[PDB]
Ligand binder design. Sequence first.
Ligand SMILES: [Cl-]
Length: 204
Amino acid sequence: SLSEWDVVEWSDDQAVFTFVYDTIQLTITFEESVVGFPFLDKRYRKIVDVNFQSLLDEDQAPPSSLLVHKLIFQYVEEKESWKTTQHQLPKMLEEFSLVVHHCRLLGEEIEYLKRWGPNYNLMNIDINNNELRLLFSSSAAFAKFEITLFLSAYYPSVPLPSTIQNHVGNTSQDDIATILSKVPLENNYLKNVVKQIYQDLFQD
Ligand SMILES: [Cl-]
C-alpha cells in the first residue's frame, strides 16, 4: 500500500533509507544492510543514525512554513540526542508521519489567523523560531495584551507554555492559562484558543 510519504529511497547496500514528504526528508541509517521485510518483519535491526533534511527556501517561504520546518527540525534534533535502546523503523515512521501531518495542519491555522485575525481582535502575529506571539487589541473592549505561545512538533497533543505581556485592561497569566486548558488538545487547538480568547475577553 502507501504511507504518508511521497517516496522512499535507499542506498545500493540498503543501509540508508530516505523518506520524503514534499520538502521534508528523513534519513535513517542502519548499522548494516537491511535484509528481509523492514516494515512487516518485527525483526530487531540496529539503527545508528536519524537525519532531518529540508528542501525549503527560507527566503521564498511564508514564515508559517518556516515554523513548520523548524518544529520538525528541532523534533528530530532532540530525538537523536538520545545516543541503551532505540526506536524501530515502523514506530519511528508512524510517529514521524503524524508529526508532519499535524505540523502542516498547524501552518494552515497560522495562515487562517494571518488572514482572518482582526475578526477576533487579533491584530498582530509574530513568529520567532518556535515562539508564536499574538497581540490582541481593542480600544472598544478596553483590552490589549500579547501572549507568547511556545510551540513544538508534538502540537496539538500537549499543553502549551505561555507568557503574557499586558498593556491595557486586567488580563492575567491565570486567565490565559485557564483558556489554554479549556480548549481540547486536538486539531484546531490554536484557532480554538483564539476564538475562546475573543469570546471571553473581547465579546465581554
Ligand atoms: Cl518490505
